[PDB]
């Protein structure tokens, strides 16, 4: 009836001590999300259905505040950078795993 932590989000943590008392055994099986707790997946007569390719060219300003409103940032991220920094950038960075 006692649990050190709530047992319903990550794993079913059960603690134990060995008979000698020299080591601690932890058993942690994963908790699976219930089906009841889930949610189902959300779902011209005469001419072509012509593809709707309009690309309005917004000027630099209203373009930048549209991007800022879309990505919840400021304008400074979208303003450009000079040749000094652009050539200072490493275009072949090291890559681990």
């Amino acid at each position: 009836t006692y649990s050190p932590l709530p047992d319903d989000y990550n794993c079913n943590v059960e603690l134990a001590l060995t008979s000698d008392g020299r080591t601690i055994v932890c058993y942690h099986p994963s908790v699976d999300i219930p089906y009841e707790h889930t949610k189902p997946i959300p779902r011209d007569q005469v001419l072509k259905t012509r593809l709707e390719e309009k690309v309005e060219h917004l000027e630099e300003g209203p373009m930048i505040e549209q991007l800022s409103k879309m990505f919840f940032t400021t304008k400074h991220r979208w303003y450009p950078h000079g040749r000094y920094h652009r050539c200072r950038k490493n275009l072949n960075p090291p890559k681990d795993r």
Partner: protein, 160 residues
């Protein structure tokens, strides 16, 4: 009948934290025996894969796994490509279970096997001292020795 020491329920008559009762020792030791045993037959059957360990080595603690690489900051008096056993295993575990030493696990319980694969030196390190208006300027270059070990295997044995 109110007990001599009863306090009426106010906002701070009782401690804010909930009352916690610990399990009785005998049933808890029996539960420990059940958990330790069942984890031991999981080890016996082999219901695990890709073990990890936390190993004390060269005054550092490394979280290593199999097929791993570590860089030790000193020479190790070993030839290249040489198999050794890391023993001071603070922690070993896998999916669904882990084992904790107090502070070290048993050598009959866990082994770590490593391979000396490189004996190199670090890139040159600058040690520079400067104090102004006193003509104080000193420069030194060091190259600390280094040893690259590859952790080959982590193996556990039924001893719980």
């Amino acid at each position: 009948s109110y007990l001599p020491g009863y306090v009426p329920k106010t906002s701070l008559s009782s401690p804010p934290w909930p009352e916690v009762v610990l399990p009785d020792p005998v049933e808890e030791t029996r539960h420990h025996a059940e958990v330790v045993k069942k984890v031991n037959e999981m080890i016996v059957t082999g219901q695990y894969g890709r073990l990890f360990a936390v190993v004390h080595f060269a005054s550092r603690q490394w979280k290593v796994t199999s097929e791993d690489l570590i860089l030790i900051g000193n020479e190790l008096d070993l030839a290249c490509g040489e198999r050794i056993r890391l023993e001071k295993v603070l922690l070993v575990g896998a999916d669904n279970f882990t084992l904790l030493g107090k502070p070290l696990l048993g050598k009959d319980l866990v082994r770590v096997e490593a391979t000396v694969i490189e004996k190199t030196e670090s890139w040159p390190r600058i040690i520079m001292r400067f104090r102004k208006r006193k003509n104080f300027k000193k420069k030194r270059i060091v190259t600390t020795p280094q040893t690259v070990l590859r952790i080959n295997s982590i193996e556990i044995a039924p001893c719980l």
